[PDB]
Design a protein around this ligand. Structure first.
Ligand SMILES: CCCCCCCCCCCCCCCCCC(=O)OC[C@H](COP(=O)([O-])OCC(O)COP(=O)([O-])OC[C@@H](COC(=O)CCCCCCCCCCCCCCCCC)OC(=O)CCCCCCCCCCCCCCCCC)OC(=O)CCCCCCCCCCCCCCCCC
Ligand SMILES: CCCCCCCCCCCCCCCCCC(=O)OC[C@H](COP(=O)(O)OCCN)OC(=O)CCCCCCCCCCCCCCCCC
Ligand SMILES: CCCCCCCCCCCCCCCCCC(=O)OC[C@H](COP(=O)(O)OCCN)OC(=O)CCCCCCCCCCCCCCCCC
Ligand SMILES: CCCCCCCCCCCCO[C@@H]1O[C@H](CO)[C@@H](O[C@H]2O[C@H](CO)[C@@H](O)[C@H](O)[C@H]2O)[C@H](O)[C@H]1O
Ligand SMILES: CCCCCCCCCCCCO[C@@H]1O[C@H](CO)[C@@H](O[C@H]2O[C@H](CO)[C@@H](O)[C@H](O)[C@H]2O)[C@H](O)[C@H]1O
Ligand SMILES: CCCCCCCCCCCCO[C@@H]1O[C@H](CO)[C@@H](O[C@H]2O[C@H](CO)[C@@H](O)[C@H](O)[C@H]2O)[C@H](O)[C@H]1O
Ligand SMILES: CCCCCCCCCCCCO[C@@H]1O[C@H](CO)[C@@H](O[C@H]2O[C@H](CO)[C@@H](O)[C@H](O)[C@H]2O)[C@H](O)[C@H]1O
Ligand SMILES: *C(=O)CCCCCCCCCCCCC
Lengths: 67, 81, 86, 172, 182, 114, 459, 61, 122, 155, 106
């Protein structure tokens, strides 16, 4: 019909399928790239995780050993 | 016949992975007699297929171009506003 | 899938045989016996059937395959299964 | 088994190659091993001791069973394939056309005129076909399921209707 | 089998007492899974009812639009950052491993997540990459507007639907957003 | 290679069966005899199946024998055994439940459908 | 009830005085009008039943059975007139007379206010049924099927007669309305144990209870289609109706006498469903299906809860229409291939596409697809039986799994697959056959829109 | 609630009319698949109006 | 985390039990602890129909976000700041719970040393 | 069919075996009745318990779906062995090994789900704190009683 | 191996008949003998909108407005969420704001 079959050879293509495929593949990568720039915390973490050993006995209210 | 078959002389194993198989069988005294029947899969538009990373990166060239423009377009407006 | 024809089946059946190194593409004709004329043996006949199976995308049972001894017989067998009457 | 030793080896060869093709996948890889496998069969092709040849076959079968692909490739329309019997629900027997209402038969005046000729041909040939089988079947009944060809001109091969008139493989 | 795997992940989410995450995964999974099955149908139709991947290959350029949707679908399924599947799967895993839960259940959910990448590569690698392994009579055609439009709409959903839904639904939990980098 | 081990639900492959090999003049004469019976029955069926004027059913005596043999033996998991087992399960269950209700220890706060 | 009894008797003169070629037209036309007027029985009240006179009354339990009974007569004439087409004219009229006399006894059975009147009419149904089976059955074994049916029933009925006459002697009345106010509790004693068994074992045989069920597959396999329709649709329900009325005067002894019969029904339903998976005869499969479905009704009647009586009522109506439909569907095949073997004629959906839709609809109701009344009835029994003992949910749940398996297996075996090559006489479905199935399935599905009228007096 | 409740039901009622026309046979089998496809596409739009109301004011009924 | 390795594979008596803690009084070692303040009243959380699990010590930030979400419709990308404010509060609330676990751990360390010191000196 | 062509009682003598085999269209050597023990088989042949799936798919059967020929003796349990039901065809793995590996996988998984329950994962965090006495009133607490207050402190 | 001359001959004969049969399945030109851009698309979707949306919603609205909502507890709404600073339309009441925040920030 509009695409005649072939024998042992690469098939015939239309422009629209190639253009549309390329456009939507780029749209995926623009969307992924754009989101990193704005939402990099969704992948790396929004807030720092404190190191629990860097807290002083004063902060946590640990009294000295003798009393 | 509407259909036409490509000339059968053109199907050759040379320069394709089918050739490499021939030397290996040659070192053993064997030959592969169907090699030409497989040749078409390695020739013409079926040669040089992308790799896995190449496939996953399809569209990266222009998606990146649009992203660089878009952030620059955003970079302008923030500076003004 | 696009329909087949008797001449189309014969063209492709020989096409596959012409890409087999144990057959002389000049001595080949639709009526060449793979055993008497082309000099092939039982083991080569099996591989020919497998090549035709891969060509047309359907299996020929061993009970039927062993009797196909010339290219015309293969052509006739395929047409019967595909209901080709051209 | 009804199969001769020669038939058994060939069926194993075809079976072995197909399962080898499932393992390799890539055609270049399959070609390399297919030639090595053909070499193994060619090595003992001229063995003349039918006790050794029979042993070689039995061992080969055991090796195939250990090395077979658990999920071998099947042609889509072969038994077990994904399209096997897919179209049987579209195959309608030809005798169903006899029950069509006249108004249904009126839409194909030319097909149903040709159909009558075939039915006439079937009616006229039947008696000869029965006679041919009777006078060719050895006393006691047939020994094989093979049927004869027609001998005279104007005779049709015995028992032909359900072979000639069977549904197409793509009936709809 | 991917769907059964994903349904298990939804059931895990039920188990860790995250009913709404399980629901969001139902909605997001609906887009790219239905697209993968339609992308597979496009291949099966073009290869004359062939379904075995061993007899495919070399379709990356022969079927460009099917290829694009199949990569987007596989990336969405595997949880590529910021595609439809990321906005549910990524949240679920963080909730699971910052929860009071069975350690074996957690480990088996992480290993299965790794397996999701493995069998997604399997479809992409064997269907699209390499040299063609199908029969000689080439009938590859994917230019029907009905095929293109139907997959095109699901492709757009597979990109933005997760983003659109995740930003419009009201919050009904306290999402745990403080945890070690690892 | 580890030998094939055959179960009831997983039969032995023909290619792995010693009987299939070692052809004997008697086994072939047995195989040739079975084929004769099958061909005799095939001819009997075909002479009615292909008859132009036959409209109906080709009654198969093999199918008549099969249904007749299956429907005849009209009269564990088929005696007092299963009944007694289930009698004590429900009697035991309902006795405990009745005791709890009488002792007010069974919660039926909103039970008003029965 | 004379507004229904007299018209039903008038079907006899109408048939006998009809012109030769009009017996089937006239009887069917006027039996449908009687079925139309039967809807006036649905003037039911919340508190009081509809008590016409000293002889007959109607309540919410007998009304749906009465409407089912009168709807079935026109359907049996449609189902019958084909295989009787070559019958002698007089013998056609006698066959129709037997069906009319069966409706007459049945509508009086369900409305009799006196239990001994109920017994006489209850036991009178035997005569027309036995005659239909043995005279118009087509096989040798119809004679043995007649005797088994006859002597299974009388074995239980004769003890029942003694028990009823004993009860009237000591209570003074067997009027059902009177027995509601004068009933006294039944205390534990060997004498009262056997009074309980006599009062119930006649009804258990007609249900039939598992163990006493072996007469039913025999009768079905040998009966003509009309005999199978009435037997499955209505006659089995006589036992259920009798048990719903007689259990009033058996309390509280039914608390412990029910146990053996609940065990037979709970286990019996699982085994009969499993047997249906291996049946080779189509009519025999449907017969064993009824035993499985009627075992639910026995369990429901015996546990005596408001939900179990509503469920049992719905089950009897729903199973009546479904089982009758299935028998007619298997008969339509039999009239073509003249065999009852289920595996003989396969792949019929290809050759009879619309008849394959009727098969699908009938199978779905048999497996009780929501919201059909088949499920509603089945569900209510499950809900109440769960309260009776939670463990029963396992047996109830398993039975639904097996019931699905053989219902669809019967659909797949006969309608799907490849057609049988040598069977070439599958003529297109007749308008008579299509109308017959639609008259089963449409009313069955319509009742989902208003199921209260089939939920009995405890609704 | 009038627009919310009304439109959330027409979505469900709209999916059934193609079923009613086939069963009632007053349709046109010339392009039934397109008719069924069109019905979904409209039912999707009518179902967005209730959804936006929920997104906006959390409405549920 | 490492805390599991220490507890299960190491010494369990000096690692907090997540189901039972705190196992020490709130004041032990704290001179005058201030009680946490709850900005949102019970009625405000009731009228807002907050999910019960969301009715914690950050509920006032959640209410503000939900109100801004309703008012900015259809702009579903509004409320950037309000959402972050609520998220950040929930982080500090989680960090406070992290401190509780560490305090509980360190007190147990102190206890065992106390028991050891009053053991060897017995 | 005539009564002489229907099944009968268990054969006793070589001639009662010879006649039974002929009735069933079998070789007398291949004919074997079910062992006599009152179960009710009669003289019906005992055919190999093999599924219909195991028969040749390419042979031209009279019934292609059932893979049966017209007139051959049907297995007693044929309805159990149709292609829709029980299958007995050989497996690429041994039956016993399949059972060992499948059970072992399930038994091992259940063991490690128990170990996971005994040693759960969790984060180093104190219990979540809720205002207003653990939300006493919101969780349906009766207001007339005054609950013991739950007090939370800063840190 | 191959076909025997009788096997070959029979296939030749059935082949001639089969191909003639298949040729006879073709339809003649007259068969079957049946008995006796945006503007168009816009109309086609105008009718569908009217018949499949407007008429149903008219019926539903009449049903819900005048038969369903006139009965108690037929349609039940989750009551609207009220936030600090809101104003009730029914009673004109103003909801107080929340108290001053401690004002941690980052
Ligand atoms: C007041 C008194 C009024 C009297 C009653 C009025 C209603 C009866 C009108 C019947 C006349 C209309 C007509 O001509 O029918 C044409 C209709 C289609 O005509 P056709 O194009 O020639 O199709 C040929 C085949 O018959 C078509 O066969 P098919 O299989 O292709 O489709 C037919 C359809 C059978 O018809 C249906 O059941 C309709 C779909 C169900 C909804 O089959 C199925 O539905 C199979 C699936 C069963 C439904 C499973 C889903 C369950 C849903 C559970 C929720 C139920 C909601 C409560 O023919 C029929 O299907 C006859 C069935 C009649 C029973 C309908 C039962 C309704 C349910
Ligand atoms: C074969 C049959 C021949 C074998 C003999 C049959 C009789 C043997 C069974 C005995 C039945 C029970 C019985 O006889 O009880 C008699 C009892 C007498 O008591 P009465 O004097 O009237 O009242 C004052 C009590 N001091 O009577 C009563 O008090 C109440 C009696 C009510 C009616 C009982 C009817 C007997 C039922 C026996 C059959 C029950 C089983 C049916 C099985 C059906 C199988 C399908
Ligand atoms: C957590 C909870 C998880 C519980 C897990 C434990 C239960 C696991 C076992 C479930 C039941 C397994 C039986 C299912 C059989 C089946 O699926 O049918 C398929 C079978 C063949 O199908 P297939 O294997 O795909 O082969 C086709 C390709 N040639 O075809 C058939 O043979 C089926 C047709 C014949 C019907 C056989 C009847 C089977 C009845 C037994 C199953 C249980 C019945 C319900 C009772 C249990 C419910 C409590
Ligand atoms: C904001 C969303 C992102 C917006 C950015 C959209 C992406 C740009 C859309 C147009 C994409 C066109 O993409 C480009 O098309 C041509 C035309 O086939 C492709 O070219 C390919 O086909 C043609 C025809 O054989 C040849 O040029 C060449 O053999 C081949 O490489 C390019 O490989 C591709 O890079
Ligand atoms: C279980 C509760 C009710 C039980 C009631 C039981 C009473 C008996 C009822 C059936 C009476 C039938 O009486 C007679 O029985 C036997 C078998 O049973 C039948 O005879 C049939 O079976 C016998 C042996 O089983 C065969 O030898 C005989 O060839 C066969 O025809 C007779 O044809 C029938 O006339
Ligand atoms: C389908 C089969 C169904 C089987 C059902 C079996 C149910 C068994 C019921 C047993 C109860 C019989 O009734 C029970 O026996 C006798 C009556 O003679 C009563 O007791 C009476 O006789 C006994 C004689 O042993 C005396 O000890 C006692 O002094 C006297 O009062 C019991 O108080 C009564 O409870
Ligand atoms: C993160 C991973 C999650 C998945 C983990 C799954 C682990 C499941 C382990 C189950 C192991 C059970 O399987 C085990 O394998 C060996 C290997 O053959 C079997 O061994 C068997 O094979 C051969 C002979 O056939 C012999 O070694 C042995 O005599 C025999 O028993 C064991 O009988 C079986 O118990
Ligand atoms: C401790 O906080 C409990 C976490 C439970 C298991 C989570 C698995 C993470 C393993 C860390 C190594 C990094 C590999 C990505």
């Amino acid at each position: 019909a509009h695409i005649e079959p072939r024998y042992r050879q690469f098939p015939q293509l239309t422009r629209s399928q190639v253009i549309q495929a390329e456009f939507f593949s780029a749209t995926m990568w623009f969307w992924i790239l754009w989101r990193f720039w704005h939402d990099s915390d969704a992948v790396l973490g929004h807030f720092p995780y404190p190191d629990p050993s860097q807290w002083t006995d004063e902060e946590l209210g640990i009294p000295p050993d003798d009393e | 016949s509407k259909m036409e078959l490509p000339d059968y002389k053109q199907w050759k194993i040379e320069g394709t992975p089918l050739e490499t198989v021939q030397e290996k069988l040659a070192a053993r005294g064997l030959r592969d007699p169907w090699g030409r029947n497989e040749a078409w899969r390695y020739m013409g538009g079926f040669a040089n297929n992308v790799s896995f990373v190449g496939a996953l990166l399809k569209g990266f060239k222009w998606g990146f171009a649009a992203f660089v423009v878009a952030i620059g377009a955003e970079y302008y407006l923030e500076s003004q506003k | 899938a696009p329909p087949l024809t008797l001449e189309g089946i014969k063209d492709r059946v020989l096409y596959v045989l012409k890409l087999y190194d144990k057959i002389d593409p000049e001595k080949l004709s639709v009526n060449s016996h793979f055993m008497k004329d082309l000099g092939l043996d039982s083991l080569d006949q099996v591989e020919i059937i497998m090549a035709m199976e891969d060509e047309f995308g359907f299996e020929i049972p061993d009970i039927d395959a062993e009797k196909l001894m010339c290219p015309q017989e293969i052509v006739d067998y395929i047409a019967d299964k595909k209901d080709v009457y051209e | 088994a009804y199969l001769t030793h020669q038939q058994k080896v060939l069926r194993l060869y075809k079976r072995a190659l197909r399962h080898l093709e499932s393992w390799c996948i890539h055609r270049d890889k399959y070609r390399y091993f297919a030639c090595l496998l053909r070499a193994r069969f060619d090595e003992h092709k001229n063995e003349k001791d039918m006790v050794k040849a029979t042993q070689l076959l039995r061992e080969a079968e055991e090796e195939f069973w250990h090395g077979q692909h658990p999920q071998p490739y099947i042609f889509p329309e072969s038994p077990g394939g994904t399209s096997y019997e897919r179209y049987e629900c579209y195959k309608v027997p030809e005798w169903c056309l006899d029950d069509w209402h006249p108004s249904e038969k009126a839409m194909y005046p030319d097909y149903f005129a040709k159909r009558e000729q075939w039915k006439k041909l079937r009616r006229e040939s039947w008696e000869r076909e029965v006679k041919q089988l009777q006078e060719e079947t050895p006393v006691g009944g047939p020994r094989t399921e093979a049927l004869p060809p027609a001998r005279k001109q104007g005779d049709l091969p015995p028992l032909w209707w359900h072979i000639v008139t069977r549904p197409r493989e793509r009936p709809m | 089998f991917s769907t059964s795997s994903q349904l298990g992940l939804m059931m895990v989410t039920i188990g860790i007492n995250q009913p709404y995450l399980a629901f969001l995964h139902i909605c997001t999974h609906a887009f790219f899974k239905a697209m993968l099955f339609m992308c597979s149908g496009s291949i099966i139709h073009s290869l004359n009812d062939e379904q075995d991947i061993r007899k495919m290959g070399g379709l990356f350029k022969a079927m460009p639009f099917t290829t694009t949707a199949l990569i987007v679908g596989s990336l969405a399924l595997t949880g590529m950052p910021f595609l439809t599947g990321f906005y549910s799967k990524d949240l679920i895993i963080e909730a699971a491993n910052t929860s009071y839960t069975n350690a074996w259940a957690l480990l088996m959910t992480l290993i299965a997540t790794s397996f999701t990448a493995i069998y997604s590569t399997r479809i992409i690698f064997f269907a699209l990459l390499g040299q063609p392994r199908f029969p000689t009579l080439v009938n590859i055609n994917e230019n029907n507007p009905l095929l293109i439009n139907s997959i095109k709409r699901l492709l757009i959903g597979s990109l933005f639907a997760g983003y659109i839904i995740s930003n419009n639904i009201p919050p009904t939990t306290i999402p745990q957003m403080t945890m070690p980098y690892y | 290679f580890p030998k094939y081990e055959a179960s009831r639900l997983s039969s032995l492959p023909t290619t792995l069966d010693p009987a299939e090999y070692d052809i004997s003049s008697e086994t072939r004469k047995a195989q040739a005899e079975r084929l004769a019976i099958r061909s005799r029955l095939k001819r009997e069926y075909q002479l009615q199946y292909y008859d132009p004027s036959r409209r109906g059913v080709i009654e198969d005596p093999a199918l008549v024998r099969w249904t007749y043999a299956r429907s005849a033996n009209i009269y564990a998991l088929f005696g007092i055994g299963p009944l007694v087992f289930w009698y004590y399960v429900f009697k035991t269950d309902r006795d405990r439940k009745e005791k709890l209700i009488q002792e007010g220890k069974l919660d039926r706060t909103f039970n008003i459908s029965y | 009830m004379l507004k229904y009894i007299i018209p039903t008797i008038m079907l006899m003169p109408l048939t006998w005085l009809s012109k030769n070629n009009m017996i089937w037209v006239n009887s069917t036309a006027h039996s449908l009008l009687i079925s139309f007027t039967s809807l006036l029985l649905m003037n039911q009240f919340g508190d009081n039943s509809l008590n016409f006179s000293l002889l007959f009354f109607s309540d919410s339990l007998s009304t749906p059975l009465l409407i089912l009974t009168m709807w079935l007569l026109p359907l049996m004439l449609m189902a019958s007139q084909h295989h009787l087409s070559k019958e002698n004219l007089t013998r056609k009229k006698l066959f129709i007379t037997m069906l009319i006399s069966l409706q007459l006894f049945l509508i009086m059975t369900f409305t009799a206010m006196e239990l001994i009147l109920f017994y006489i009419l209850f036991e009178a149904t035997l005569v027309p049924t036995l005659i239909i089976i043995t005279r118009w059955g087509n096989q040798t074994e119809r004679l043995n099927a007649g005797l088994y049916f006859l002597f299974y029933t009388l074995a239980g009925s004769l003890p029942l007669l003694v028990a009823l006459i004993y009860i009237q002697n000591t209570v003074g009345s067997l009027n059902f309305l009177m027995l509601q106010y004068w009933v006294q509790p039944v205390h534990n004693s060997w004498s009262n144990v056997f009074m309980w068994l006599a009062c119930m074992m006649a009804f258990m045989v007609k249900m039939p209870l598992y163990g006493l069920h072996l007469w039913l597959p025999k009768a079905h396999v040998e009966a003509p289609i009309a005999g199978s329709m009435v037997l499955a649709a209505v006659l089995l329900k006589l036992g259920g109706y009798g048990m719903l009325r007689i259990t009033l005067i058996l309390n509280p002894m039914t608390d412990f006498m029910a146990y053996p019969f609940i065990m037979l029904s709970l286990w019996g339903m699982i085994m009969t469903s499993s047997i249906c998976l291996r049946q080779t005869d189509l009519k025999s499969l449907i017969a064993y299906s009824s035993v499985s479905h009627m075992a639910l009704v026995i369990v429901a009647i015996l546990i005596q809860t408001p939900w179990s009586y509503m469920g049992a009522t719905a089950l009897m109506i729903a199973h009546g229409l479904t089982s009758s439909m299935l028998f007619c569907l298997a008969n339509s095949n039999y009239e073509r291939i003249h065999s009852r073997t289920m595996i003989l004629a396969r792949g019929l959906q290809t050759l009879l596409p619309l008849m394959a839709t009727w098969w699908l609809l009938a199978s779905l109701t048999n497996l009780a697809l929501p919201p059909t009344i088949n499920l509603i009835g089945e569900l209510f029994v499950v809900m109440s039986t769960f309260s009776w003992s939670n463990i029963t949910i396992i047996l109830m749940g398993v039975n639904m799994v097996i019931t699905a398996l053989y219902s669809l297996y019967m659909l797949i075996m006969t309608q799907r697959g490849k057609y049988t090559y040598h069977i070439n006489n599958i003529s297109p479905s007749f308008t008579r056959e299509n109308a017959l199935m639609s008259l089963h399935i449409l009313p069955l599905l319509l009742l989902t829109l208003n199921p209260k009228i089939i939920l009995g007096p405890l609704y | 609630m009038n627009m919310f409740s009304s439109l959330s039901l027409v979505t469900l009622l709209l999916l059934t009319m193609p079923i009613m026309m086939m069963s009632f046979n007053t349709y046109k089998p010339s392009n039934y698949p397109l008719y069924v496809k069109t019905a979904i596409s409209y039912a999707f739009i009518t179902s967005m109006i209730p959804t936006m109301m929920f997104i906006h004011s959390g409405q549920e009924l | 985390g490492a805390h599991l390795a220490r507890r299960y594979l190491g010494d369990a008596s000096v690692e907090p039990d997540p189901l039972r803690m705190p196992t020490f009084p709130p004041d032990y070692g704290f001179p005058e602890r201030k009680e946490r303040e709850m900005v949102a009243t019970q009625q405000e959380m009731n009228d807002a129909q907050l999910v019960l699990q969301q009715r914690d010590y950050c509920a006032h930030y959640l209410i503000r976000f939900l109100k801004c979400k309703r008012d900015s419709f259809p702009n579903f990308l509004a409320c950037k700041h309000e959402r972050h404010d609520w998220d950040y509060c929930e982080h500090l609330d989680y960090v406070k719970r992290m401190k509780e676990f560490e305090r509980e751990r360190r007190l147990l360390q102190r206890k065992k040393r106390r028991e050891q010191r009053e053991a060897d000196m017995a | 069919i005539t009564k002489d062509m229907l099944p009968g009682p268990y054969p006793k003598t070589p001639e009662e075996r010879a006649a039974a085999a002929k009735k069933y269209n079998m070789r007398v050597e291949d004919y074997e009745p079910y062992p006599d023990d009152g179960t009710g088989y009669g003289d019906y042949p005992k055919l190999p318990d093999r599924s219909q799936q195991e028969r040749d798919p390419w042979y031209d059967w009279d019934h292609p779906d059932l893979r049966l020929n017209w007139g051959e003796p049907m297995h007693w349990d044929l309805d159990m062995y149709i292609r829709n039901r029980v299958d007995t065809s050989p497996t690429p793995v041994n039956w016993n090994l399949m059972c060992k590996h499948l059970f072992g996988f399930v038994a091992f998984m259940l063991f490690m789900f128990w170990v996971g329950e005994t040693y759960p994962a969790y984060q180093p965090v104190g219990p979540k704190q809720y205002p207003y006495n653990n939300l006493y009133l919101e969780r349906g607490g009766d207001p007339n009683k005054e609950p013991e207050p739950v007090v939370h402190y800063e840190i | 191996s191959g076909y025997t001359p009788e096997e070959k001959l029979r296939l030749q004969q059935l082949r001639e008949l089969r191909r003639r049969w298949l040729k006879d399945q073709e339809l003649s030109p007259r068969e079957p003998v049946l008995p006796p851009n945006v503007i168009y698309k816009t109309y086609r979707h105008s009718i569908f909108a009217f018949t499949h949306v407007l008429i149903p919603v008219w019926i539903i609205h009449y049903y819900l407005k005048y038969h369903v909502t006139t009965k108690p507890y037929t349609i039940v709404e989750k009551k609207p969420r009220i936030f600090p600073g809101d104003t009730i339309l029914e009673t004109g009441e103003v909801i107080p704001p929340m108290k001053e925040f401690p004002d941690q920030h980052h």
